[PDB]
Amino acid sequence: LETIEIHPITFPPEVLARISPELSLQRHLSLGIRPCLRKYEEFRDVAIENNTLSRYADAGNIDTKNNILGSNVLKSGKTIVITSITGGIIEEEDIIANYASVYPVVEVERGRVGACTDEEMTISQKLHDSILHSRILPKKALKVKAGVRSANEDGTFSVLYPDEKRKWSYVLYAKIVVLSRTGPVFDLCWNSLMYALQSVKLPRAFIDERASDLRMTIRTRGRSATIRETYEIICDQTKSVPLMINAKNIAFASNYGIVELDPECQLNTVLIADLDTEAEETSIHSTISILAAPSGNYKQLTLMGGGAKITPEMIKRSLLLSRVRADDLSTRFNI
Amino acid sequence: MSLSVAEKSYLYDSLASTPSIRPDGRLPHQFRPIEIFTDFLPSSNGSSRIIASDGSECIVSIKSKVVDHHVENELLQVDVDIAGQRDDALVVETITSLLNKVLKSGSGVDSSKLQLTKKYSFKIFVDVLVISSHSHPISLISFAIYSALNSTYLPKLISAFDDLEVEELPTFHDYDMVKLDINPPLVFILAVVGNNMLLDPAANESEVANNGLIISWSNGKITSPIRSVALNDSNVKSFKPHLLKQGLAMVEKYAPDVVRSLENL
Amino acid sequence: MSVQAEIGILDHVDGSSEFVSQDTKVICSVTGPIEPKARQELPTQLALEIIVRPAKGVATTREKVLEDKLRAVLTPLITRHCYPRQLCQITCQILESGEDEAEFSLRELSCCINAAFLALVDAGIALNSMCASIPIAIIKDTSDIIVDPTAEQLKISLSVHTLALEFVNGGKVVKNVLLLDSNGDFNEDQLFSLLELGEQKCQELVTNIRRIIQDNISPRLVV
Amino acid sequence: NKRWKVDIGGKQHAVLMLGSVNLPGGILRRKSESDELQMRSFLKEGDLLNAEVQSLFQDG
Amino acid sequence: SLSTSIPLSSQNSSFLSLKKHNNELLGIFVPCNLPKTTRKVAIENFNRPSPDDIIQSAQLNAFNEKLENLNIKSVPKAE
Amino acid sequence: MSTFIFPGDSFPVDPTTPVKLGPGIYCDPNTQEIRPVNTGVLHVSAKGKSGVQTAYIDYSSKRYIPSVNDFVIGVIIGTFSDSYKVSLQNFSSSVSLSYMAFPNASKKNRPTLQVGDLVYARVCTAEKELEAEIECFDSTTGRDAGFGILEDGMIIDVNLNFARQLLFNNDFPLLKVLAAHTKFEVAIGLNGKIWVKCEELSNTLACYRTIMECCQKNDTAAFKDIAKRQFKEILT
Amino acid sequence: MACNFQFPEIAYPGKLICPQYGTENKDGEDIIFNYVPGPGTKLIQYEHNGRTLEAITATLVGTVRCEEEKTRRTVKNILVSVLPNDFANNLPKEGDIVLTRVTRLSLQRANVEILAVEDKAATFSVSQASSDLGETFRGIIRSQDVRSTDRDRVKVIECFKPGDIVRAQVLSLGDGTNYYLTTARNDLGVVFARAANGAGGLMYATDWQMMTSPVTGATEKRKCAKP
Amino acid sequence: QDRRRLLGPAAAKPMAFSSEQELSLHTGFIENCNGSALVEARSLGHQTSLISAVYGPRSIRGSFTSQGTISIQLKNGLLEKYNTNELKEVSSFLMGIFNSVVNLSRYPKSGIDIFVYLTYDKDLTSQISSLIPHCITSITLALADAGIELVDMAGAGEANGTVVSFIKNGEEIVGFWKDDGDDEDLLECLDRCKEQYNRYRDLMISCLMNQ
Numbered sequence A: 001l002e003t004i005e006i007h008p009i010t011f012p013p014e015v016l017a018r019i020s021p022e023l024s025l026q027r028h029l030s031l032g033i034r035p036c037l038r039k040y041e042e043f044r045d046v047a048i049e050n051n052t053l054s055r056y057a058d059a060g061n062i063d064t065k066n067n068i069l070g071s072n073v074l075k076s077g078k079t080i081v082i083t084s085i086t087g088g089i090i091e092e093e094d095i096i097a098n099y100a101s102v103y104p105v106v107e108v109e110r111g112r113v114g115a116c117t118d119e120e121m122t123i124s125q126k127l128h129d130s131i132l133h134s135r136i137l138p139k140k141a142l143k144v145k146a147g148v149r150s151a152n153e154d155g156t157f158s159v160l161y162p163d164e165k166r167k168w169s170y171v172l173y174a175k176i177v178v179l180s181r182t183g184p185v186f187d188l189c190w191n192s193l194m195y196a197l198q199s200v201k202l203p204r205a206f207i208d209e210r211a212s213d214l215r216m217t218i219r220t221r222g223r224s225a226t227i228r229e230t231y232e233i234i235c236d237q238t239k240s241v242p243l244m245i246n247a248k249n250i251a252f253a254s255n256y257g258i259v260e261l262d263p264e265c266q267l268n269t270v271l272i273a274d275l276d277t278e279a280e281e282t283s284i285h286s287t288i289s290i291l292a293a294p295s296g297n298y299k300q301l302t303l304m305g306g307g308a309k310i311t312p313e314m315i316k317r318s319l320l321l322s323r324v325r326a327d328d329l330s331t332r333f334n335i
Numbered sequence B: 001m002s003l004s005v006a007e008k009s010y011l012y013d014s015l016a017s018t019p020s021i022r023p024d025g026r027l028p029h030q031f032r033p034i035e036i037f038t039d040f041l042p043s044s045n046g047s048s049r050i051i052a053s054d055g056s057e058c059i060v061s062i063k064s065k066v067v068d069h070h071v072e073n074e075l076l077q078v079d080v081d082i083a084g085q086r087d088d089a090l091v092v093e094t095i096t097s098l099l100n101k102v103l104k105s106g107s108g109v110d111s112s113k114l115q116l117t118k119k120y121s122f123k124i125f126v127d128v129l130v131i132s133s134h135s136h137p138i139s140l141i142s143f144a145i146y147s148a149l150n151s152t153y154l155p156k157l158i159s160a161f162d163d164l165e166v167e168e169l170p171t172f173h174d175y176d177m178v179k180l181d182i183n184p185p186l187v188f189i190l191a192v193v194g195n196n197m198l199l200d201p202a203a204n205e206s207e208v209a210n211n212g213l214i215i216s217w218s219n220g221k222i223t224s225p226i227r228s229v230a231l232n233d234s235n236v237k238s239f240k241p242h243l244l245k246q247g248l249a250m251v252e253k254y255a256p257d258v259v260r261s262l263e264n265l
Numbered sequence C: 001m002s003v004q005a006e007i008g009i010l011d012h013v014d015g016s017s018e019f020v021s022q023d024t025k026v027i028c029s030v031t032g033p034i035e036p037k038a039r040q041e042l043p044t045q046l047a048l049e050i051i052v053r054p055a056k057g058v059a060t061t062r063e064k065v066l067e068d069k070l071r072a073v074l075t076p077l078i079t080r081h082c083y084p085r086q087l088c089q090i091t092c093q094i095l096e097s098g099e100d101e102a103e104f105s106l107r108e109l110s111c112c113i114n115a116a117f118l119a120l121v122d123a124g125i126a127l128n129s130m131c132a133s134i135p136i137a138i139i140k141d142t143s144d145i146i147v148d149p150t151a152e153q154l155k156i157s158l159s160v161h162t163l164a165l166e167f168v169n170g171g172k173v174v175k176n177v178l179l180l181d182s183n184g185d186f187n188e189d190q191l192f193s194l195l196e197l198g199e200q201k202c203q204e205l206v207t208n209i210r211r212i213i214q215d216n217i218s219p220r221l222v223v
Numbered sequence D: 001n002k003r004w005k006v007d008i009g010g011k012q013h014a015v016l017m018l019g020s021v022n023l024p025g026g027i028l029r030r031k032s033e034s035d036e037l038q039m040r041s042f043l044k045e046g047d048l049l050n051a052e053v054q055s056l057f058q059d060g
Numbered sequence E: 001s002l003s004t005s006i007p008l009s010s011q012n013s014s015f016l017s018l019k020k021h022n023n024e025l026l027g028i029f030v031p032c033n034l035p036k037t038t039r040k041v042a043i044e045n046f047n048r049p050s051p052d053d054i055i056q057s058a059q060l061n062a063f064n065e066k067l068e069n070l071n072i073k074s075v076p077k078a079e
Numbered sequence F: 001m002s003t004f005i006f007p008g009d010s011f012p013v014d015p016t017t018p019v020k021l022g023p024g025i026y027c028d029p030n031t032q033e034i035r036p037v038n039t040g041v042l043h044v045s046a047k048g049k050s051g052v053q054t055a056y057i058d059y060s061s062k063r064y065i066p067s068v069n070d071f072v073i074g075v076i077i078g079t080f081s082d083s084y085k086v087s088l089q090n091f092s093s094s095v096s097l098s099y100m101a102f103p104n105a106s107k108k109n110r111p112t113l114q115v116g117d118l119v120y121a122r123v124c125t126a127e128k129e130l131e132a133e134i135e136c137f138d139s140t141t142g143r144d145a146g147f148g149i150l151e152d153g154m155i156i157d158v159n160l161n162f163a164r165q166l167l168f169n170n171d172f173p174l175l176k177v178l179a180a181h182t183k184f185e186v187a188i189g190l191n192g193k194i195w196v197k198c199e200e201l202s203n204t205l206a207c208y209r210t211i212m213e214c215c216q217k218n219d220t221a222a223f224k225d226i227a228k229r230q231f232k233e234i235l236t
Numbered sequence G: 001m002a003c004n005f006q007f008p009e010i011a012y013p014g015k016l017i018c019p020q021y022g023t024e025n026k027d028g029e030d031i032i033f034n035y036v037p038g039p040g041t042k043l044i045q046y047e048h049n050g051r052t053l054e055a056i057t058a059t060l061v062g063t064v065r066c067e068e069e070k071t072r073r074t075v076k077n078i079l080v081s082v083l084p085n086d087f088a089n090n091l092p093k094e095g096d097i098v099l100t101r102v103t104r105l106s107l108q109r110a111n112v113e114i115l116a117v118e119d120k121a122a123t124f125s126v127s128q129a130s131s132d133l134g135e136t137f138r139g140i141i142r143s144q145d146v147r148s149t150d151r152d153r154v155k156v157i158e159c160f161k162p163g164d165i166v167r168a169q170v171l172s173l174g175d176g177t178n179y180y181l182t183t184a185r186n187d188l189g190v191v192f193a194r195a196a197n198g199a200g201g202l203m204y205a206t207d208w209q210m211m212t213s214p215v216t217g218a219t220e221k222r223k224c225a226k227p
Numbered sequence H: 001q002d003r004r005r006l007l008g009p010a011a012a013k014p015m016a017f018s019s020e021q022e023l024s025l026h027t028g029f030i031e032n033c034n035g036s037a038l039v040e041a042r043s044l045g046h047q048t049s050l051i052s053a054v055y056g057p058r059s060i061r062g063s064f065t066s067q068g069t070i071s072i073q074l075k076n077g078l079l080e081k082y083n084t085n086e087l088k089e090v091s092s093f094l095m096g097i098f099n100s101v102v103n104l105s106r107y108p109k110s111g112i113d114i115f116v117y118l119t120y121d122k123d124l125t126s127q128i129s130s131l132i133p134h135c136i137t138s139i140t141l142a143l144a145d146a147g148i149e150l151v152d153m154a155g156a157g158e159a160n161g162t163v164v165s166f167i168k169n170g171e172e173i174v175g176f177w178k179d180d181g182d183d184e185d186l187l188e189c190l191d192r193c194k195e196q197y198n199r200y201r202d203l204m205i206s207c208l209m210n211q
Helices: A013-019 A021-029 A118-134 A186-197 A278-283 A312-332 B005-016 B090-102 B138-149 B241-263 C062-077 C106-123 C151-155 C188-217 D036-042 E016-020 E038-047 E050-055 E061-078 F160-167 F174-181 F201-217 F222-233 H084-101 H128-146 H186-207
Strands: A046-050 A070-076 A079-090 A147-151 A157-160 A169-179 A201-207 A214-216 A228-230 A235-242 A252-260 A269-273 A286-293 A297-305 B035-038 B046-051 B057-068 B076-082 B115-117 B120-132 B153-157 B172-179 B186-193 B196-199 B211-218 B221-229 C003-007 C015-021 C024-034 C047-053 C087-096 C130-139 C144-147 C157-168 C173-186 D003-006 D014-017 F002-005 F025-027 F034-036 F040-044 F054-058 F071-079 F083-087 F095-098 F118-125 F132-135 F148-150 F154-157 F185-188 F193-197 G016-019 G021-025 G030-037 G041-048 G051-058 G062-068 G076-083 G097-106 G109-117 G138-142 G165-172 G180-182 G189-194 G205-207 G210-212 G219-221 H022-027 H035-042 H046-058 H069-075 H111-123 H155-159 H162-167 H172-178
Touching (some): A013 A021, A013 A278, A013 G097, A013 G109, A046 A186, A079 A186, A079 A201, A118 A186, A118 A297, A118 C062, A118 C173, A157 A201, A169 A186, A186 A252, A252 A312, A269 A312, A286 A312, A297 A312, A297 C062, A312 C188, B005 B186, B035 B138, B046 B138, B057 B153, B090 B138, B090 B221, B090 H084, B138 B241, B186 B241, B211 B241, B221 B241, B241 H186, C003 C106, C015 C106, C024 C106, C047 C062, C062 C106, C062 C157, C062 C173, C087 C106, C106 C157, C130 C173, C130 C188, C144 C188, C151 C157, C173 C188, E016 H022, E038 E050, F025 F054, F071 F095, F071 F193, F154 F201, F174 F201, F174 F222, F201 F222, G016 G021, G016 G030, G016 G076, G030 G051, G041 G076, G097 G138, H022 H128, H022 H186, H035 H128, H046 H128, H069 H084, H084 H111, H084 H128, H084 H172, H111 H128, H128 H155, H128 H162, H128 H186
Parallel strands (some): A147 A201, A214 A228, C047 C087, F095 F132, G030 G076, G138 G180
Antiparallel strands (some): A070 A079, A079 A169, A147 A157, A201 A235, A252 A269, A286 A297, A297 C173, B035 B046, B046 B057, B057 B120, B186 B196, B186 B211, B211 B221, B221 H172, C003 C015, C015 C024, C130 C144, C130 C157, C157 C173, F025 F034, F040 F054, F071 F083, F071 F118, F083 F095, F118 F132, F154 F193, F185 F193, G021 G030, G041 G051, G097 G109, G109 G138, G165 G180, G165 G189, G205 G210, H022 H035, H046 H111, H155 H162
16 A cells, blocks of 8 residues: 555546446536536537428428428537427416426437337326426417318408308327437426427318208217217318417526535536536436426426435526526527 | 358359359249239238249238229328337338339329329329248249239229319229229349349348349339439449440330239239 | 324225325325336336325325426335335325415425325335424415415415425434425525424424324224 | 257157267357357257257157 | 549538547637646646556566465476 | 334433444444334343343334345245255245255265255355245254254245244243144244144144134234134034 | 558558458569458459459458468468447457456356457457346356366355356357356456455455455455456 | 327318429538538529538347338428338438448448438429439438448439439449439430439539548
């Protein structure tokens, strides 16, 4: 003893993390930097392109093989999130049940042949949940009415507008796929969702004269109720009025970590903003997820205190970082 | 694989030389003994049981409904289902695609032998059960569909429907059936082992072949779909333009005889 | 009433509990340490595979989001290094929600967390600390906080908050906050109010659960 | 790691094992320890070989 | 000759070529968070241990003493 | 000192004063302080009666974890060449049993056993990292002690706290009560299993029914009434 | 790179490196050359000019480096190998080292999950497999390979436990069920472990069979890695 | 709804409705993958972008396999709609080409997971025939970037809904597809597609030359 040696040779960061992320994280931390070799309170930059995927990307092309309502591509680090928002049609304050939700599928690709994995499903539902409790989309907005589409015998056809029997509401989905996830992806999914939602337009919708007496003769081999009325409602996207949305309730996310440094365990409490590598995802067990909106309103904070010490002092700094990041993204893409 | 290393080299040598002798010992133009049995469901429009020499068995069954065709762009639906495979393994669904494309309307098959007035088409529900597989099924299915679709009887229309007759649903004669004539393609499989192009591989041949070429015969000529396939993973090689042109030439000659023998039982 | 808890009720399982909070009623079982499945073998760690199954209809995606929330809280509660390479399956069946399941999960979650603690106490699996969790809402009518709310009070919420805290050195010094899930609109002065109140209201709940386990354990273990 | 399982077309598989096998490279040589590899080099799955019945057991 | 050597007109509307070069934080398609050279200081910290450790992978006295314990035992095997 | 403890509490002796550790006291692997982790009654011994005090918590369980010098009943749930594989109590980790674990058994003196025989054994090795081993031959005593292979009888599942409490206090009156009502043979496992056998079918069953009944209620006065009523029932 | 008078500096898939047979006179005397592929090359068959041709064709995007295994002069055998994350260019095989972690300890063996392969060091790679990116594969360290000074009575519990991170050389491919490891050499063993049987402070080797805990004050015995 | 995923209201129904090309390549632009490629093709007709990612060589132990294998997922675009079966056919097609081009013998117990993302296809004016050059360009690049062995770069043209893939400078054919082309196109197409393959050959070689 006292002479020294028997420490193994130096392994690169990646290899070091595969070997021990507990170890690799702390080592990075002593120089004051994240394992992604950047300072604690910088993040990943965010670049979006919008309407490069949506139906309504052009004015002189409306093509029938497309139906994508709003769309965004967002790249942060290497982790790329592609969002498509898509409708459907279902015939039907401050109270939670007057705000509606997106019913997303979030798909993540980490080298898994499947696409029904426990990591992606939990994302998708939690994501439905965030959208409900943030109160973005009031149900009056999907509650549309229909005019009349009447064909004439004059060899023309008139589709008659109301000002935009039965009633209808739309539903909203989001097909979000993720390529090469390297850290917590949740906030990426949420950032892109908003730029998409603020790009959503809805088709117009129409019905024939005596819609309430149009027949259904589709069901057969009953046994009664094999001839009835039904309502039938096509959608026409030759006009699309744009989404009516609550701007105040738009949030933009961030992600945090709380972790401790010990000098004898790479042989107090330290705050990281955002997580980018495998080593950070693995071993930053105490973490706070905040969605902050850019007037000093917060629509969710979720703290998971996976083991390490949290003083609320760290919590108090993160709520300010998150709003200032929210203000940065806001002005950056003018949306 | 399921054969020997020794067995595969013997075959490769056998087949790849000038005579191309093989366990049957056929020249490249000859086909193994098949047995056609038909019309065994009184409940279906037409039905087909084909037993081949490797002991492969396909059963092909034809059911229908008449439908308005202006809300449809498909008239023939193939459902393939292979005993001992599930309803979504890669090979099963790829077979479904191939077959649906072979039988695609206005492409090597009629879309005017299936219509009884110019508003109403019969949607033919092809439903295919493979009883035992251990060799490729598609050629045998093609051959079974031929005999079937020439055994397909449809309801005979009560009366000559117009498209303005009264503007209600077409309604069939009670007993009287119309024979369905309609000439489906016949899929023929060719196999390449060296520079030698051989019609109709057996199981054994399929396991050593470099590649094969699936091509189809409709209406007195060759036509699309054309597709190459690799009939193993582990004895695979590439091939030349001239060998692809010789396989054209071979089918053109040897196909017609087969369609005429298969047509009349 | 307020709360009631019983342990030992189920007999075939290593440990069990029945947690009732007014209308909300969760019955729980911990099974294990038992033989790992190979996909749920972890080297130095006990594995957790948690299942939350709702009363009405059949479990969906929602219960996985809940599983994650539960798993977060439970991983430093149960001494992971106590059993290496063994699995514990915690199966939490909801006998009544008595609310609306998609909309609010505030009472549901708080109840599961407590029934999990008790079940684990009955089970005998090592527990570093006492954990309970309390449900906190804010109603829009007064625009203020109401602690431990009923079903009616939940309907008229603008926002809802659960907190869970880890209890040491007399079960009365807050060590850490293992969860604080604050959903709906809040601003900071409310949130530190929700901690403050939160502290004292948790520590009462800890007293009540503490008391229950002593009384129910004591005729069993005798000398 | 100790036997080949042989398909004779029976009700179960027949066993062929290391004290019961001649081997190329001698008569028994080219193999100094049991390994699943060393077995595998001589005889691959699907290879065909003529072998005599040493004792019939009551298993099948 | 098959390849030849033509440049490529981009005409990139997706913006993937900037993403490829993430670079430092003063780069293209990165936010700023340090006004200093981010990479190089990290690299330098890599550089100071590596020649020292790789060469001195058996030069320290602990290792030298341990090599002798292996070497003595080793000898009856060889002979 | 004999006082009720909870997890998440302070230790009620000092950590400065030497103590040997027993069940249910954990030492933090960072902090290097000892703390309770189980809910029960804590006992501490006093020096002058021990060399060094041993401390432990009595806590109820229904799930058995291997400890050494414990006596356990198992069923043999697998036949393998060199060893047999035991399950002591159901759904749990393998417990292994050498071929030569029996008195007078060697490799020229191999047993022939089968699945579904009952064994009674000492835990002679226990790890969590590796498998626990049982020998049916007591190496400390040097006489197996009537350890061996049980046959017949009927295994009653019990509580862990009940099972240790019947074994480690011979003032516990259940078997005093029972000994009046039949003559029987008893084997007590610490894995939450206890075996009993009489000569006759009636007699075994009454024991099986009674210990079971007694165990549920788990009350001291209950035990007398339950025996007397049940042993009449089986002869009525 | 040049190695004679016929080699390409840069090569790519489907690009000829060199003819299967060569010739050059060195010292007035021909030396027939006989080229064969190794890793990163294949000998691929061709017909050109009306005759069979066989040739050495690069498979991988890289520098074309010569190495060896070794008319009226000798034939000299020149192996051809074009060397270029990279777990797509190595799989565990013999003479590659792997970084492995113990996922179960057992009586005469240790299952150890492979988390990384080392390049055939100074050039290192990490496996694409992770427990967070999904899928696992394992290989085995045996009781016989733990050491080799004494090794037929040193059990793996005496030198290993679960959750320890170990560097081991793949000894053979072995059976299809496992990869056969060796930790026997004096540069293989535990890279690091955590004291208290995988629960305490992070500990590193301070002797070849002792790892000194910085938080308990005591030695936790192992087999250890060295430079 | 379903137990594995949220599918929202289930009585709800969709909305009813109312060288001539430039390929520019990119690689090595996203990470968690052994190699990736990006192919964007612009034409008068339609503009398209295809992403590919190739994962592994992976070990598939607990069984010994004669040689490695290749597994192809096509994923439906976010702006293109196709039947699942067609994607299977094309997956099957591409596998049989790749079987012939990738050398498989340096890698025992191997499975390789190939993902083809057919993300964007947009018309300014079957369909699945047209994107086969672009799929083959993408995937090859990816196998090259990762360090997976290959006989020759694989690459193809499309002449009149007919797709012919060659290796060895137009000399050998590794696959043929004809679907809804015209009878007797053979000479025009082979001549026309050779031009195309030689042209995209060198493009892929030059992408691989910036790294």
